[PDB]
Amino acid sequence: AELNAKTLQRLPGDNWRVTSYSGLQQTPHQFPRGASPGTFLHSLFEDLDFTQPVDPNWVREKLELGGFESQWEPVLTEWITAVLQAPLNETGVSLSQLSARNKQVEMEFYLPISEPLIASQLDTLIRQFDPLSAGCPPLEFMQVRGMLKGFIDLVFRHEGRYYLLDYKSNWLGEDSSAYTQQAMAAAMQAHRYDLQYQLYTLALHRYLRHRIADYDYEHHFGGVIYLFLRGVDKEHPQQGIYTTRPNAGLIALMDEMFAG
Amino acid sequence: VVVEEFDGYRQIWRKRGVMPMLRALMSARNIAENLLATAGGERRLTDILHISELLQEAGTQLESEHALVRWLSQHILEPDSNASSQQMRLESDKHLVQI
C-alpha cells in the first residue's frame, strides 16, 4: 500500500534561552592560579567582616578548610588588610567603613531581553558613547531572546550614593606596576568586561528604579568599581582598582533597546 | 571521501553518542532499508537496533569512548546472559508457529 510521512512546515523552534555574560563572550603574584584558587579568593570576601580587622586564627582555618597549608596565612592576613583599607574613587571610601546595613553580597538578578539582541545592532550603540569600545572588533554573539543572568560581587551605598563592585584575580605572570590605568583597561577590552559592567549597570538601574520611590540615575548612582585582588598594593592607591561611570546617555538608549 | 564521512561520523559520535551516530550511519548508507529488503534481514535489523539501545545505556555511564569499545568487546567475548541482554522477539512472529 501507499504511505507517506508528514513534514513540518514552520521552523521547529526559535531561540529562547536564559544565559549570562559567559554565554556571550564564550608577593600577591606567587599565589596559585586556576579556578580553585580564584574561587577561594572570592570565598574569602564572601563571609569576611569588613569593619572588624583580620584574625590570623580565621585565616588559618579558612586555608585549612580549603586544603592549603600554613605557608599562606602569614602572607594573607596582611594583604587582606591592605584591600579593606584601600580608598576607592574620588570619595576615598574604605571597605572597612561599610556597615552591615549597607552591605549586599552576591546579588543574583534576572534581566529579560524582549526583542532578539543582534550583535551589530548593539556594539554600534556601545562604541558610540563608550570610548572603551573603540578597541577590539565588535562583539560576536548569536541572536538571543530571553532572560539574562549575572552575579554581582558586592553592592553598597555610601553618603546616599550606591556603588557597584566586582572581583577579578587572574594575572598569573604579573606582580609590579603592570597593573595601571592603561593596562587594566587594556585587559578590560581583552576579556570583554566592557559589556559586563554595562549590563550590570542596566540591571542595577532597573533594580534601583523599581525598589526606590522617586529614583534618579544621576543622583543616586556612584559608578562602577572593578577590584583586582592581586593588584591591590599599599604603595599605589591607583593600582588594583578601576572606576568608570556610564555616560547616562548610553543606559537611557540601552534600556529602550532592551524594552522594545 | 570515505575517511571524510567516517570523520564526520566520529564528530557526531563525540558530540552526541552511540545511538545518534548509528542513526546517521543507517540513514546515509540506507542499510536499514536494504536489510528489510534482504530475506531474513528484519531479524538482523532488530538486533542492530537493540545493540544500539544497550550501547546507549552503557554509553551514558562511561564517558570515555575507548572504555565504551572495551565494554562492548568484553561483553562479546563472554555473553552476559542478562534478561535485558536477551534477544527480543521478531515482529510478526505472532503469525508464526511458536516453538
Place this chain on the structure above:
Amino acid sequence: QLSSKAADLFDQYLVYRPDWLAQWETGHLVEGLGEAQAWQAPLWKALVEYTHQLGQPRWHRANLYQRFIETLESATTCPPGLPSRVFICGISALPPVYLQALQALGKHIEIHLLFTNPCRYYWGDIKDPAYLAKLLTRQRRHSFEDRELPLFRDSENAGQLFNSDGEQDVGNPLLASWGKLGRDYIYLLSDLESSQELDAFVDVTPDNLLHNIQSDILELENRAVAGVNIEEFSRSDNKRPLDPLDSSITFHVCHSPQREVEVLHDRLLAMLEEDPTLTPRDIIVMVADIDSYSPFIQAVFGSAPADRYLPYAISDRRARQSHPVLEAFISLLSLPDSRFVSEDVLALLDVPVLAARFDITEEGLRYLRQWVNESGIRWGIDDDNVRELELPATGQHTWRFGLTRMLLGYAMESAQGEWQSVLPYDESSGLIAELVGHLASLLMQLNIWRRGLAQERPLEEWLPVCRDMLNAFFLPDAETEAAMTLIEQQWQAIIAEGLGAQYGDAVPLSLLRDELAQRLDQERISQRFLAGPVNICTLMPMRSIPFKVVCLLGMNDGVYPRQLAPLGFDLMSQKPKRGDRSRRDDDRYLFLEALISAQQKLYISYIGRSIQDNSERFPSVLVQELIDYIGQSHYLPGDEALNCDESEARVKAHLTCLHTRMPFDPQNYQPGERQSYAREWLPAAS
C-alpha cells in the same frame, strides 16, 4: 548505618513531634505509643546530656519554638530585625508547628500565603460537630461578595460530614482519593484564629475533555454515572458529550522506554505544528525516574535531523561532571582491600590524568596491554600481598614478578637462560622499554599507599590524606581541577562534621569511602530547568508550574508512585497525625497537581505490553482511576443511547492508542490522525 537512620528520625521527631522529645528530655514516656519507643527516649535524653558535656548550645528546634510563640504572644508590635512582609508561594504542605509559629508571627509581620487548591469550596475534614461553627466564617472575594460552603447549612449535616471523622462524599472522587495531602493542609489553614482568608478563582469554561475534568474538580461534583437504577442504566445521553477531535486528554500504550519516548517526540511535533503559538519552554515532560529514561531522552532528541531537531533540557538528573576521576579515586581508596587484578590496574590507566602524572602515552598503553598479557601479570602486586590474603606464597604471576621479568629481558636476551628462576622477557630490549620504568613507578606508589591506608586513624589524621593522594596519583588539568576540588570539598566537609561533633575514636577507611559514594551522587543540577528548551525531569513534590502541554512517562504499575517504606521502628507511622508527610501521599497529590496544571493538552503514556516477552503490564492506579472517571462521565457522539458500561469502554478504547513495536512498522506512516514525522524509516516502510 544505625547512627544515620536514628539521626534521621530524631530530625523528623524535632519537626513533627516536638512534644515527644519534650517528654523524653525529662525521662517520662508517652502513653499509648508504639513499641520500640522504650530504648529511644534515653538515646535522645543522653544525646541532650552528651551535647551538654561538650559545651555546645542546648537550644534546638524542638524546645525553641514554644518559647518563640510565647515571646511573640505578649510583646510589643515592633521587634527589631524582622522583615516587613514575607511570602509563602508554591508550598502545599507544611507541618503544624510552622503554622503555629506563623500564626503568632502575624500579629507583627504581614504574611501572605499563596496556596493553590483545586476546589473553590471547602473539601477538608472536620474535628467535632462544634468545630464547624468556627468553619462557617466567610471567604472574601474580589467581588466583595462572601463565599460559603455549597448548599449552605444543608451540606454540613447532609451525608458529607459523617460520624466522628471528616468529610465522606467529598464531591468528585478524584479529589478525595488523590488529594489526601491537601486535605489536612486546608484543614490546618482554616484552623488559624487570626488569619484572614480571601479567594480568587477563575472559572474554567468546560469545552475540551481536560477543561471538563478541571471543572468537575473545581465545582466539586460527581459526573460519573453509576447506574443505580435500570432507567438510569439504559440511557447514556445524560453524560457529557465528548468530541472525537479533542486531543486534550490522551492515553498512549507503548512497548519499551525507547519506543515510548520516540513516539512522544512525534506527538510533540504534532502539537507544535497544530498551534500558531507553542513554545517548547511551555511544554513539560515528567518521568517517574529520570535516571532510567535519561539515555533514551538524549538519544531520540539528539538523533533528530536539523529541520526536525528541537531543543531539550534534562533536569533533576544526578549531577556528574567527570565520571572516571570520581570512580577511579574511589577505586584508589579500595587499595588496601584490592586484589590488584591486571585488568583493574589497566582500568586505572584508562584515566588520562592518572597516565599523565606518570607520562604514559595513549600510544604506549597499547604496548602495556600486550606486555602485561604476555609477561604473565595476573595476580596481586607483591608477594607480601599474597600472604596478607592468607594464600600460599608463590613468587610468580605478580606485578613484581612481571616487572622483574620485563626488566630482566631489557638487560639480557631470553636465549641466555634463567637467572633468579625468572625468565627474561625479550619483547622490549629497546627505547620502548622506557615505558616499563614509568609503569614500575606507578606500582611503587600503589605499594606505598596500600600500606598506609590499612591502619585506622583518627579523623584529624585523615584530613591531609585526600590532598596527598590527589597530587601524587593525578596531574591536574583545566577540566579536572573542578572535579578534584569537589572531591576535597566533600571529603573535608565530612571530616569537619566529624571533628565538629568531637569524635576521637579511630575510623577505618572503609567507612569514609562508602560515605563518599553516598554524598557525591546526591548532587544534582536544576540550572537547565526553565532555560527554554523542552523541560525533562522527574516529578518533584511541592513544585507545580502551570503549563500548556504536560506529558507523563513511566506510569506502569509499581513504578509510580515511588514506594519508600518506613524504617519500621519509626513511631510516627504507628500513630499518624494531620501534618505527617509520606512519600506515597506526595506522589499521589503530585498526579493531581499535574492534572490541574495543564491548561491545554495532557499527555499520559505507559507501557501496556513488555517488548521482551510480550506480556501484559498495567498502568498506575492513579491513571487507572482517571480513565475510569473519563469513561463513566462522558460518551461518544456516535451512540447517544447504548448503555452505561458499553459507552464507558467505548470512550476508554477511543482515547487509548496502541503504538507499534518497531519504528519501521508501516502502520505509523499510514495517513490519518497519528502519523510519524520520521523520514528516515519512510524508505524502510515502503
Place this chain on the structure above:
Amino acid sequence: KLQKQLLEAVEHKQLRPLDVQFALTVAGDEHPAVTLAAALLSHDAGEGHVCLPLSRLENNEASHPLLATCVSEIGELQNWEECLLASQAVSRGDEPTPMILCGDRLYLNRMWCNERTVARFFNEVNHAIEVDEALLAQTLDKLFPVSDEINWQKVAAAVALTRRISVISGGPGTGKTTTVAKLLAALIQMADGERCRIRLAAPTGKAAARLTESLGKALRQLPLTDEQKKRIPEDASTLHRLLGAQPGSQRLRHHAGNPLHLDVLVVDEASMIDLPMMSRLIDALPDHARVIFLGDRDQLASVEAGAVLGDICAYANAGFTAERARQLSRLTGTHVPAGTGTEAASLRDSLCLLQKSGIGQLAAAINRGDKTAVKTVFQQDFTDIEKRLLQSGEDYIAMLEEALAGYGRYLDLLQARAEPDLIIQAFNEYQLLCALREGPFGVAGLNERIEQFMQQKRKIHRWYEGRPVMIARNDSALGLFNGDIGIALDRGQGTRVWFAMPDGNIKSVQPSRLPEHETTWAMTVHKSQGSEFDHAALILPSQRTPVVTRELVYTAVTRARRRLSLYADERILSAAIATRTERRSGLAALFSS
C-alpha cells in the same frame, strides 16, 4: 638505603625511572655500590653508550653528582672489580647474568652478545676468496684507465673482491658510489655462469633513493651485456624493510632461521649502523654471502655511542699487512704500501680508505693541526668557505642576518606562493647546523631566536604559512621517516603539510596527523646525516664545552653540497678540532687480542 637517595635523581632528572627500577630489581639488597653501578649502566645504555668502564665510575671527575653519595656507601674500598663480581648481579660471562664484567668494562648481556657477534664476524668466520689474479687484474685494468700511479679505488675493488666482508671508507664527494659501480660491474663480469644476486640497503630511505640514482648514473657509464644488465639490482629499501621488521613487535622475519637470499649485499652509509643492527644483520647472513659497507671514519654517526664503523676504521690508519701489500701489488699492478707491525691481520686487510676527492681541503686539514685549519679558511677564501668571528652578541645578530641570506631564496619561494614539490627541493638549498642542543647557541637556542628574528622582520608571520617542518620520529603508517622534511601550505582544500615520496608523487598530510614535528630552520648535525644541502651554516657557542667535537664540525662541513658559511670563534672552533669523540666500546680492545 640508597633507594630513597636514588628517588631524588628522578626529581633531579639525572636518571630515568627505567634506570632506577632496573637497579633495585637486579642488584637488590646487595651493597649500594652494585645498585648505583647498575643505575649508571642503565642510564648510559639508555643514552646509547655501549659499556661503562670501571675507571670512569671510580673517578670523582665523572658527572651525575649523585655519584658523590657513593663515598658514603662504597666507603672507598678502591676495588670495583672485587665488589661487583662478588654479587650475583655481575659475573664473568659463565653464568646467565644480566651484567658482564670482562675487560674492566661493565655492561649488559645484550651489549655483550652484540659486541662478541660483531667483533668475531670481522675476525673469524670470514674466508679469503681466492680467484685468478691475472683475470681479476685484466678486469680492473679495463675499468680504470690510469695504471701509472697507485689508485685507491683500484685497491678498494681488489680488497672487496678478494675478501668476503670488506669496508670502503671515504669522505663525501670522493667517488665512493662510482667505486661501488666499478666493484659491482667487476663482480658480475667475474662470474659469467654463476648466479649473482645484488642487494642495495641503507639505514634510511632518503639515502637509499640517493643510492639508487647515484648507482644508476655510475653504472650506465660502463658497458654491459643483457645478462649483466639483467643481474643489475633494481632498487634499495630500508634496512628495516630488508630484514622485515614488524611495526608492532620487535621480531624479524629472517634472523637465524631464515637467511637473506642473496649473493652480495651493499650497505650505503654504514655510519648510521648502530651496534644492535650490525649484530642483527650478521646472524641473518649466510656463509656464501659477501657484504660491503659504505661510509666515512670521521662521520659523527661512526663515533657516536653505539656505533660500529667508528672503531673498525680506527685500525685502517695502520695500513695493510706486509703480505697483503705484496698480494695487492700483484693485483692492481702497482706498489701497495705495507703497514708497520702486526696488530690484527683479518681486520686490517678488509679495510680500505679513499684519500682522493674548499670543502675537501678544509676537511683534510681537520685531522691535522690547527695551523693548517686557520690557514685554509683564511687565504684565497676558496669561494666555498667563509669565516665570521663571533664573540659579542652584536656578531650574533649579524649571524642571523646572513642566515636569512641563505634562506633568502627559500623564504621568497614561500612568499611567492609556489608549489610544494619545488619548495621541498628548495629547502634543501640551505640549512643551519649547531653543536649544542640548548643555550645561546643550540637547537633550543636558535629556534627561539630565529623565530624571534622572523617576528622582528616581516618575511613570514606566525603552523604558519610556508613553514618547513621535519619529522622527529619514524612513522610506519604515513610512510615518512625521521630526518625527512615537509612543507605546510594551503592548496585551497585546506592547510596541510606535503611530502615527496620516492616515486615522485606528492602526499598531503593534515597538521594533526603528523606523529612528531619541530622547527627545522636549524638542525642537529647528527640528524642531518645522509641529507644533502646546497648551502650550510655552522653555529658554534662562545662557551667551551666538550659537546663541540671534531666529527661534529666535520659532518657540518660535509653536509653542504657546494656553498658553506661559518660563524665561530677561532679559539673555540680550532680547539674543538683537536678534541675528538671518545668511544668506550670494547670492540677495539678485542681486535688487539
